[PDB]
Motif scaffolding. Sequence first.
Motif, short mmCIF file in Angstrom:
data_model
loop_
_atom_site.label_atom_id
_atom_site.label_comp_id
_atom_site.label_asym_id
_atom_site.label_seq_id
_atom_site.Cartn_x
_atom_site.Cartn_y
_atom_site.Cartn_z
N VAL A 89 -33.97 -34.87 -96.78
CA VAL A 89 -33.67 -36.21 -96.31
C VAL A 89 -35.03 -37.12 -96.19
O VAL A 89 -35.76 -36.90 -95.21
CB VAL A 89 -32.82 -36.50 -95.17
CG1 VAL A 89 -32.76 -37.97 -94.75
CG2 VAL A 89 -31.33 -35.82 -95.36
N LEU A 119 -23.54 -45.58 -97.78
CA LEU A 119 -24.04 -44.26 -97.39
C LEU A 119 -23.23 -43.67 -96.28
O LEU A 119 -23.34 -42.48 -95.95
CB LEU A 119 -25.68 -44.48 -96.97
CG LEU A 119 -26.69 -45.12 -97.87
CD1 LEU A 119 -27.79 -45.21 -97.17
CD2 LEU A 119 -27.09 -43.86 -99.10
N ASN A 146 -31.70 -33.98 -103.11
CA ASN A 146 -32.18 -34.62 -101.86
C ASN A 146 -31.77 -36.19 -101.67
O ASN A 146 -31.28 -37.03 -102.72
CB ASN A 146 -33.67 -34.57 -102.06
CG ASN A 146 -34.10 -33.30 -102.70
OD1 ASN A 146 -33.86 -32.30 -101.76
ND2 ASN A 146 -34.76 -33.36 -103.83
N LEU A 147 -31.62 -36.59 -100.55
CA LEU A 147 -31.05 -37.95 -100.42
C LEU A 147 -32.35 -38.68 -99.94
O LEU A 147 -33.18 -38.43 -98.80
CB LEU A 147 -30.08 -38.04 -99.08
CG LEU A 147 -30.05 -39.53 -98.42
CD1 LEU A 147 -29.50 -40.23 -99.73
CD2 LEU A 147 -29.05 -39.57 -97.35
N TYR A 160 -24.66 -42.97 -104.60
CA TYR A 160 -23.88 -42.41 -103.38
C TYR A 160 -22.77 -42.85 -102.90
O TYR A 160 -22.00 -42.32 -101.92
CB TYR A 160 -25.04 -42.66 -102.25
CG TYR A 160 -26.32 -41.77 -102.50
CD1 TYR A 160 -27.42 -42.39 -102.59
CD2 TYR A 160 -26.12 -40.26 -102.55
CE1 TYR A 160 -28.65 -41.64 -102.72
CE2 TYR A 160 -27.33 -39.56 -103.01
CZ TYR A 160 -28.44 -40.23 -102.92
OH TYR A 160 -29.64 -39.54 -103.34
N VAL A 164 -26.09 -32.77 -96.94
CA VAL A 164 -27.43 -33.14 -98.02
C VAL A 164 -27.78 -31.54 -98.40
O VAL A 164 -28.41 -30.85 -97.27
CB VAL A 164 -28.44 -33.98 -97.34
CG1 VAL A 164 -29.71 -33.68 -98.25
CG2 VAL A 164 -28.23 -35.29 -97.63
N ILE A 216 -21.65 -39.70 -96.58
CA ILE A 216 -22.34 -38.51 -96.63
C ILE A 216 -22.37 -37.72 -95.56
O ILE A 216 -22.47 -38.14 -94.43
CB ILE A 216 -24.01 -39.06 -96.90
CG1 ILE A 216 -24.04 -39.82 -98.04
CG2 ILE A 216 -24.75 -37.79 -96.95
CD1 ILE A 216 -25.62 -40.51 -98.37
N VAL A 240 -24.03 -34.35 -100.87
CA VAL A 240 -25.12 -34.59 -101.81
C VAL A 240 -25.90 -33.28 -102.28
O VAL A 240 -26.75 -32.94 -101.54
CB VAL A 240 -26.15 -35.48 -101.00
CG1 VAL A 240 -27.60 -35.78 -102.10
CG2 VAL A 240 -25.59 -36.90 -101.12
N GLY A 249 -28.57 -36.03 -105.60
CA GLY A 249 -29.47 -36.84 -104.91
C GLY A 249 -30.65 -37.14 -106.01
O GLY A 249 -30.45 -37.07 -107.20
#
Length: 506
Positions: free
Chosen positions: A63, A53, A38-39, A29, A59, A56, A35, A7
Amino acid sequence: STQVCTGTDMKLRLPASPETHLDMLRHLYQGCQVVQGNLELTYLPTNASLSFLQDIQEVQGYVLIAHNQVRQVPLQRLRIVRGTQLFEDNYALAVLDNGDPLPVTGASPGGLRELQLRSLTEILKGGVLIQRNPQLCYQDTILWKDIFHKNNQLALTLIDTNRSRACHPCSPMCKGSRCWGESSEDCQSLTRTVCAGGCARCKGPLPTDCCHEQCAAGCTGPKHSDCLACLHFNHSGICELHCPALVTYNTDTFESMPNPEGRYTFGASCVTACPYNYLSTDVGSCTLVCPLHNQEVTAEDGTQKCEKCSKPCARVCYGLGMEHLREVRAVTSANIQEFAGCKKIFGSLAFLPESFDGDPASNTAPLQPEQLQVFETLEEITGYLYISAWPDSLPDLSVFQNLQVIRGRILHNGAYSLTLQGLGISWLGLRSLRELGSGLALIHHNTHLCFVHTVPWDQLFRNPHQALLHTANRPEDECVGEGLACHQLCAKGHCWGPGPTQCVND
Ligand SMILES: *[C@@H]1O[C@H](CO)[C@@H](O[C@@H]2O[C@H](CO)[C@@H](O)[C@H](O)[C@H]2NC(C)=O)[C@H](O)[C@H]1NC(C)=O
Ligand SMILES: *[C@@H]1O[C@H](CO)[C@@H](O)[C@H](O)[C@H]1NC(C)=O
Ligand SMILES: *[C@@H]1O[C@H](CO)[C@@H](O)[C@H](O)[C@H]1NC(C)=O
């Protein structure tokens, strides 16, 4: 090949290049399923296509979705947010200022309308912050407590409902009026609050529907192999509390012996070998930074391990983000000398306006072009290189002519390993640079910059998620127009600059 990506770490910082911001995310992505980090989906315009996206599933960090004008963010397969990191230190999920305000009928107002996180059944640590989202519905009909894990010590919430439109009700199919959107496919599926016995997650109401203890987010069967996500580690199909150690001890002697079943820890999984650009450790883990007094050891093939350097340990050059420089945001006259004779730098190097402007208040005299000659011995940077200011007198970055590798173990805004912006350079001159371990390269708004297209960027990258983002530099037609190009002796037309010294790869 990978299903894992990394991320970012830009928080609410404005993207310096709005024209390439989306292209960065896409590169970052696309095809990604897990991930690390962080997203963060921010400052996206209303016409932004975010289909990349869709894959995904988890994460590791938090987020963040903020300051977007886009109407939807397709995260329908996001199953779990581990929250190993939190926005403002509390939220695993943050949705902020997504909507124009704070010929009407025609243009449909911009802003997120519905979350549609219909697979999101698990937030291990952290809470939910949803504020100032004018066109947003349903966020209030969701039972967040179900999503929050039992052990979640930060099951906090701050949900704003001030809307600027009327919401249609949840589909009839949705049991307790709990949905992520108007669709009949957005009914919140509960997996905690409606369980038998006292199990954390479950597929139904029956004690048999309970999920295995090692599962997280949910399950299909009762086995530790029917988990939707592993609470700790995925060990080739089965979720476990820890991986198999790399060594087995002797019952009487307690002397090490390699373990054929040994695996390192990498994210939430047990792997036989750490992936490219990562460091293998004593404690069987895959990390970007070594242990206390343990230090990096480059093996021929490149596999850099972390060895015990507790007592006998040679001093190294730490860069920005590391040790004492951990909070320093720029190279200045006050620290420039610390790099004298440094072949390798553990950390990053960043030059900003202030670097050369100098800070009279702190009596930190501006940095002098001649002082930069300190990096001429520099061959490696484990972090990143960021340059948003450079002395007009200097035509290139030749001071870094012996720079061979930029691992990018630490990326700027958690995404870029090499950034060159707003400079006055005429060419790069990074003649020895043969690799960018990870991260993207961002080069923009460098008016007099040529010799960008002459560089074989693809050769420097090492994974599918890397690329060079560039815009607003000197037009290629002007460069060629002025007659600029690689020296006749440059084998394949590749070079970092004008002269014969700038050619590349034979
Ligand atoms: C744990 O990792 C395994 C991989 O070892 C995952 O299994 C894969 O599942 C996908 C989709 O179900 C298949 O396309 C792959 O072929 C599977 N790989 C193998 C070799 O099993 C499994 O889903 C993971 N479990 C969890 C909960 O993360
Ligand atoms: C998105 O908005 C920008 C605003 O400058 C515009 O240039 C671009 O053409 C738009 N893209 C689409 C998909 O229309
Ligand atoms: C919601 O609107 C009310 C009244 O306009 C305001 O007092 C409140 O601060 C708003 N909530 C947030 C945090 O946006």
